[PDB]
């Protein structure tokens, strides 16, 4: 389970970094609507990511 968890924990921060980069890039623009757009994507993406990680975990540490 260990290798599974740090895989999950590490990919989450790596996904968060990608999402953050998208938000900062949109921020550099000065367009508020662009940032909202990148942010809505990041939020939906992170929610889906939970589903994936939870799915992976439930599937491997369940039976």
């Amino acid at each position: 389970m260990g290798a599974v968890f740090i895989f999950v924990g590490a990919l989450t921060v790596l996904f968060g970094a990608i999402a953050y980069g998208e938000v900062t890039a949109a921020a550099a623009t000065g367009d508020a609507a662009a940032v909202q757009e990148a942010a809505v994507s990041a939020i939906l993406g992170l929610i889906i990511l939970l589903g994936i990680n939870l799915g992976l975990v439930a599937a491997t540490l369940g039976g």
Binding site: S41, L44, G45, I48, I52, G55, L56, A58, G63
Partner: protein
């Protein structure tokens, strides 16, 4: 991070799996060989598809979005191999294999076709895929599970674990289709690609590693 960078990460992840599955299989007798070969095909095909996208090929403009043909072509080729692997564990016969591979192929064909359709009618194609997917899930958790339950303990256990991984995770793909570029485009192209890389890696390479880990244990008792 650019799209091509993500595609390269996908290709490398798939290559690492492919190398692992090939080498693990070097220790395999007549009974286990086909499983290892199947895993190699699954991750190998995916590795090449990712390279194709990373090299900037198959990026198809559709209305005001970009659809990746090699993504859907990969799925058309590799998902029936995953269904095949599961069916082998379950102990299916040719007629049973035919049903699930057919249902699987309808999902992937419908999803690819829908992604390539500009108009609102692409959701009808999605819908056709979604219904076929519910049929596939039924087959996985019903009939195929019943077949698997007649086999050895170690085999039934691997089947259920891989079945659970597959049903839960494959169910996420249509939501990414709907929320991503092919649907309402609430996910950026980058987030869409990043989610699919991770998901593909778990459903192919994670799946394979779970199988590798179980195979070593069964052979070592």
């Amino acid at each position: 991070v650019g799209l091509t960078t993500l595609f390269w990460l996908g290709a490398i992840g798939m290559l690492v799996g492919t190398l692992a599955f090939a080498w693990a299989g070097r220790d395999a007798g007549s009974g286990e060989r086909r499983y290892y070969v199947t895993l190699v095909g699954i991750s190998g095909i995916a590795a090449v598809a990712y390279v194709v996208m990373a090299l900037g090929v198959g990026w198809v403009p559709v209305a005001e979005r970009t659809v990746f043909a090699p993504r859907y072509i990969d799925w058309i080729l590799t998902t029936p191999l995953i269904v095949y692997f599961l069916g082998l564990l379950a102990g299916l016969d040719s007629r049973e294999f035919g049903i699930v591979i057919t249902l699987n192929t309808v999902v992937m064909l419908a999803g690819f076709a829908g992604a390539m359709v500009p108009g609102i009618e692409r959701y009808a194609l999605f819908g056709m895929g979604a219904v076929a997917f519910l049929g596939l899930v039924y087959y996985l958790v019903g009939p195929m599970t019943e077949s698997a339950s007649q086999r050895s303990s170690g085999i039934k256990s691997l089947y259920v674990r891989l079945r659970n991984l597959t049903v839960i995770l494959w169910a996420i793909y249509p939501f990414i289709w709907l929320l991503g570029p092919p649907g309402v485009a609430l996910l950026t192209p980058t987030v869409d690609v990043a989610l699919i890389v991770y998901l593909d890696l778990v459903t192919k390479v994670g799946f394979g590693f779970i199988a590798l880990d179980a195979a070593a244990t069964l052979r070592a008792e």
